[PDB]
Amino acid sequence: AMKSYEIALIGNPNVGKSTIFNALTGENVYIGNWPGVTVEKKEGEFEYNGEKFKVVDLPGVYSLTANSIDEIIARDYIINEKPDLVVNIVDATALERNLYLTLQLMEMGANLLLALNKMDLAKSLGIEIDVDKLEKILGVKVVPLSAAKKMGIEELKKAISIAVKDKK
Template identity: 55%
Template sequence: MSSHVPNNKLENKGMYKDTINIALAGNPNVGKSVIFNQLTGLSQTIGNWPGKTVERMEGHLDFLGYRFNIVDLPGIYSLSTYSLEEIVSREYIVSDDVDVIINVVDATNLERNLFFTFQLLELKVPLIIAINQMDILRRRNMEIDFKALE
């Protein structure tokens, strides 16, 4: 996992409060719901078909005196989109409600996923990039140059 969170953005977005709102965003079928379930302890249904998550799901994690409200968003390829699922995601991502975005990307299809990542970076919201499905990448004897991504 790599992150891009400028210190001044943390202060500007009010990160030092008791509740932090986190959006789990990324292309369809990259593992957002799996991460959501791990963080919240909930049992969001996981499926490997387009449009599986069609509305946002919310849960929370309490840790070190902070409440992290975590929102699992439908898969989205671009901020300039018109499908119902992607509109739900876009509207939440660009709202003032989001303190941090965790952009879940598929290690096996990095180029396609990073198109959306670059759009998220332009929003100037603190962003954490979670590279998922590394086990599949390794089985294919492939690697990611993490230094190049920084």
């Protein structure tokens, strides 16, 4: 009946991935781990419009090399599980370093959406981001938000429903 999609959340540690995951899924959540390791695996889902969205939280990583079991898990999933959409959660207060992962993600031909979190913190720290320039330079859609202050989440949901169609 209801059409489904699979989306993955990935970014550096401490960017608000857990906060965004909870905001998107609420009570619909299973918590376990990846096979044979003590790396936590969070999965949940939300309904938006008439469509259903399975959300997998990938391990927080700084790059997608193979220097850790986390990078391995994350890379294996992105490439071999082929999610309809990778939501790359990026911290606006440390853009440069967050974008290292982003570049690798683009390399892999991930269907990508950029969630530029912590806009409040950046503003309060005097950090300026030209979101439009960023969107332009990367050729990826950028959704500014502040998940901890419950701002932009709805915007994000909408952008997700739109971005998954870009896998076709």
